[PDB]
Amino acid sequence: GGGRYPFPKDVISMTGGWWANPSNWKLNGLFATGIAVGLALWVSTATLPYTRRREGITSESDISKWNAAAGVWRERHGKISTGEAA
């Protein structure tokens, strides 16, 4: 190619090394795209149930109930809101 220079061949890295372009890469590229696609599908199908919209899950009546019970606990324990002590 353009601008090249020698390099040791015994040097082995998980990455290419120097100007790595083996004469089989179409097959290995096929294997890698297949694994990557299968992984992406497995992940999306697995994470589907663990999704939810921020809203729409919890009814407001439940929120009103919970806030009522909050007031009940607060007054049983005789507590006052922020700033009232003035």
Binding site: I63, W66, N67, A70, K79
Partner: protein, 91 residues
Amino acid sequence: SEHQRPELVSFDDINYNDHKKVREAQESYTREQFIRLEALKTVRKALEKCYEESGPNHFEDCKNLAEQYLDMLPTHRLQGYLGYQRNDPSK
């Protein structure tokens, strides 16, 4: 599942020489503290639900839940048995 439900012992009713009772009381005090923590966590979850559903209204609809959380946080937490096992408050 076979959910165990052990027995509740206290340090004020035992003599400290019968080690089994002391271990029972230690485990009891710690288990109840963990239960207080779980109650706090449920409050936290409901608060986040009130915020995520309300939005700009959270200032009102989540008020008591938020004050309840901020009152529970300093008290509902692990604080250990040794400070009651080695201190009688009646003196």
